[PDB]
């Protein structure tokens, strides 16, 4: 989630 994390897996 880019709404909560800086990068996506």
């Amino acid at each position: 989630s880019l709404l909560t994390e800086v990068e996506t897996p």
Partner: antibody
Amino acid sequence: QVQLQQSGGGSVKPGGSLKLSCSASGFSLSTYAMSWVRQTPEKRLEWVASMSSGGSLYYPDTVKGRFTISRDTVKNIVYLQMSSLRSEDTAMYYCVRGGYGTSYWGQGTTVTVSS
Amino acid sequence: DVLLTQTPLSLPVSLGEQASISCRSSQSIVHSIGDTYLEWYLQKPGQSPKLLIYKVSNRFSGVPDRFSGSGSGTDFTLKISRVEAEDLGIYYCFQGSHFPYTFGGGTKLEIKR
């Protein structure tokens, strides 16, 4: 201490184009993922674009090829450039900072697509 | 797309009672064999949405523990244990495990008094 202010909303004709800004403070843009989420007049939330901290760009198909997210880390601003605007693009546009298990949304700027 | 079906649409509740909000996905979300990025947001009247819960069950900083996320398979729940007046507004679920990211349609929490 995080602020985000969106500006650049208003009225625009179907087919026209508009550039939104999100002006950020209390953090470095570059260290977070920045996104745009819109809320339609019927109160649906819809994800419209993301830019990771590393700069990868992500869009849904409903706006692909029309919307461009970008950032300027000197002015510390994130932008959404919209074109071939349609009626269904009418909405409140929020700018969202994401990272480290946190999300922070600005107050929104309203885009009305109308004649 | 991952479709999120959120129920109920309206949720009237008295002060101090419990509210349950459910979100049903069109598929198992788990990104790969890693995390499930299912989030809950609240929008209060006149404000923007704010994060309540991330990865199914973690509370965002400063959310009180009477807010509780769970779920598995295709069913996710947000439980609000002792509802106060300030909890009113529109709740949304959200998945960020697969592109395009999607939201549930929302649940309006109303306070009975």
